[PDB]
């Protein structure tokens, strides 16, 4: 046991020395050569109303017009960004839903929560009514996040500190991702869907592969539980947000953080993070009844999106980058452009 | 300007909104309560009796008593980090806390169960989200405590205790100790009650507590309190 611990400590020290040697220059020194971005003004266009419970998850579709949102009332609503009309209303058997996902083609939707079971609902049913297609059971903890890898397979995150990849046609988990010491909170798929990063309460993120199913790399630096994690549009980096009131951008090739985002007046935790189409700007939902925009290159505050009357819980940028939706516990989802 | 399909979609959206409002108004009539306590605290017996009167994850029990609907949520089986999802129960009406009164001299793999139960009760009471939520303590092991105190003294658990070995004084001391853990007496209430073989008394006490809370909630909402 002692020899194994000494070997682990030596490997950790070697990894730290390597990460330090590879840090030839910081992102700030390189980004200081370009002028900063101007003041970004975003005015709320649509004010979606109809929810009677706190919002916790929302996701857009490939068409960049439909967005599915989940609430604690047990009703999944698919809103239309241009008309604000409800396309479907899925009644959940367990009202304690916490995560929701919208498949790329939009034919199926996934949801989960404290029930420890992920329900899949088909929207293109010939019967005409949205009915549960498959129930993925086996998780010993609440579902924190889930995303569609493909029309056939899906990935889900549970609070049992271990994730699993479930096949729809089969319904049995094929790959089991283990290694997290804390409960996994959020996921983020890469543009190629080959690798994905996952953050847990242990203040560290881990990269995982679909076919291999092994931890490709680990990233540390956080001081609290990582609540949100998003992939960079290029697929070579990813941002993470924890309760320490600061974001952290890590690179899959550098194996260390590039720049930190923080401000003295911010002392509250972060709930959601999402990049833009080009990644020039980053958005972060905070608990101070608003969200904040940061410069991905200079970390300068680009703007503040206020109006929500409760803790901001989720936010998502359209695939085309036209507008960005934000949902909070106040039961209202606002679209800014 | 809206075409036929647009008007039809708007009408369907209005109908869906009406249905959602009706569902919400119907669900608002049912009270919501959260059950907490150790597995050996008797929660199973309480749930069984409340169901008679009327797998991993959380359990949801429904029962009606005196024209009033209740939704008991049991999250004891969820052995994970509670501070990351307990906030979901912010809108809960009451918190039914069960503790093993007789399990004062046993050992658990704090070493003692009473200290852990008190710590959990204090953490749930002083929680930043349960500031205006009421807690109701239930002692489901009073008979075992009476049968054991005659042989095993209570001093083993509370060395500082020096009162009489009778059951009344010990019960009063335990009640005072569990009540002193409330650091927000000005904003919330703790309704204590001793459970026995009888079950209707506990249901009546829960109904009265839920009524007294709905009353205070309505008084705070209308602007009086």
């Amino acid at each position: 046991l002692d020899q194994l611990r000494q070997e682990a400590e030596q490997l950790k020290n070697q990894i730290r020395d390597a990460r330090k040697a590879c840090a030839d220059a910081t992102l700030s020194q390189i980004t200081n050569n370009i002028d900063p971005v101007g003041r970004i003004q975003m005015r709320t266009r649509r004010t979606l109303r109809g929810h009677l419970a706190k919002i916790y998850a929302m996701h857009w579709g490939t068409d960049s017009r439909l967005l599915v949102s989940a609430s604690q009332d047990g009703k999944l609503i698919i809103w239309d960004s241009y008309t604000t009309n409800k396309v479907h209303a899925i009644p959940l058997r367990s009202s304690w839903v916490m995560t929701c996902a919208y498949a790329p083609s939009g034919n199926y939707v996934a949801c989960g929560g404290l029930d420890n079971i992920c329900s899949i609902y088909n929207l293109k049913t010939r019967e005409g009514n949205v009915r549960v297609s498959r129930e993925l059971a086996g998780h010993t903890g609440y579902l924190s996040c889930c995303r569609f890898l493909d029309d056939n397979q899906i990935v889900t995150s549970s609070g049992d500190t271990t994730c699993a990849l479930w096949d729809i046609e089969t319904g049995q988990q094929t790959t089991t991702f283990t290694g997290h010491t804390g409960d996994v909170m959020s996921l983020s798929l890469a543009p190629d869907t080959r690798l994905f990063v996952s953050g847990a309460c242990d203040a560290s993120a881990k990269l995982w592969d679909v076919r291999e199913g092994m931890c490709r790399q680990t990233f540390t630096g956080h001081e609290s539980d990582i609540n949100a994690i998003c992939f960079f549009p290029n697929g070579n980096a990813f941002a993470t947000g924890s309760d320490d009131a600061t974001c952290r951008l890590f690179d899959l090739r550098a194996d260390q953080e590039l720049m930190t985002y923080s401000h003295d007046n911010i002392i509250c935790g972060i709930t959601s993070v999402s990049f833009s189409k080009s990644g020039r700007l980053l958005l972060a939902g905070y608990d101070d009844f608003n969200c904040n925009v940061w410069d991905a290159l200079k970390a300068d505050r680009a703007g503040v999106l206020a109006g929500h009357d409760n803790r901001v819980s989720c936010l998502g940028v359209t695939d085309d980058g036209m507008a960005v939706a934000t949902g909070s516990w106040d039961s209202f989802l606002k679209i800014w452009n | 300007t809206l075409s036929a399909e647009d008007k039809a979609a708007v009408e369907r959206s209005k109908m869906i909104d009406r249905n959602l409002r009706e569902d919400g108004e119907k669900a608002a009539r049912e009270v919501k309560l959260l059950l907490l306590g150790a597995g050996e605290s008797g929660k199973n017996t309480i749930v069984k009796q409340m169901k008679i009167i009327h797998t991993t994850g959380i359990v949801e029990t429904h029962f009606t008593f005196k024209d009033l609907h209740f939704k008991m949520f049991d999250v004891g089986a969820q052995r994970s980090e509670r501070k990351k999802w307990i906030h979901c129960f912010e809108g809960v009406t009451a918190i039914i806390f069960c503790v093993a009164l007789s399990d004062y001299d046993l050992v658990l793999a704090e070493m003692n169960r009473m200290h852990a139960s008190m710590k959990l009760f204090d953490s749930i009471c002083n929680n930043k989200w349960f500031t205006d939520t009421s807690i109701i303590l239930f002692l489901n092991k009073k008979d075992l405590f009476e049968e054991k105190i005659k042989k095993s003294p209570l001093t083993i658990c509370y060395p500082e205790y020096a009162g009489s070995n009778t059951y009344e004084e010990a019960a009063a001391y335990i009640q005072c100790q569990f009540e002193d853990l409330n650091k927000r007496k000005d904003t919330k209430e703790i309704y204590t009650h001793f459970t026995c073989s009888t079950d209707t008394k506990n249901v009546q006490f829960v109904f009265d507590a839920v009524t007294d809370v709905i009353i205070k909630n309505n008084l705070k909402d209308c602007g009086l309190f």
Partner: single-chain antibody
Amino acid sequence: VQLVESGGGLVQPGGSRKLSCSASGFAFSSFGMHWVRQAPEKGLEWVAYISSGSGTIYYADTVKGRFTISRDDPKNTLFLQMTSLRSEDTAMYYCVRSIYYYGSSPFDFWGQGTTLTVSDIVMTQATSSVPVTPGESVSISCRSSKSLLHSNGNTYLYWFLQRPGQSPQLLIYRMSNLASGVPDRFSGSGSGTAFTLTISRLEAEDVGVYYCMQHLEYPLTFGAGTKLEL
């Protein structure tokens, strides 16, 4: 999904008939119903329509006020009271489902209909009969009096294929989305008022009549219909 109609037969002009369509196997409440008649050797024609929850009911000028379409969702049955009957009302009435939402495929299912015997944007198809052998591609042109392209950015157009002894089948809706279950051989395009339905390779199953429909407004109008036979 199955629709069975009842009511009809020989009815004098002064008589009345209550046509009843039994709906089952789908959300009848959420899906509205359209009545489309088809007289002998004549094109289709819209009769009436009821919206979800009986909130909006419309009638065509040819039947406005005379006929009465009602809806029964709890029973899952559609009813049509026909008080007066004229010498030209004889036609097979077909019930068609229609749901309205972003990405919907209304008028996808057509009922078997019932035979009843009694003792506005203009749509026109260039060619009516185009004899062609299987294997060779086919093209059916259509023209609308009014521009169907709406300011939203879509074109309200529908094509229906009716085979001998079978009800019409929705091929393409909105001029840009292929109906579910239809082969990919069919394609539709258009610009403003001139539209074209192309078929890569004609087959025996394609034998039938193709009817066009515009859905820009309430008064739906159907064309003469282009028939294809090997």
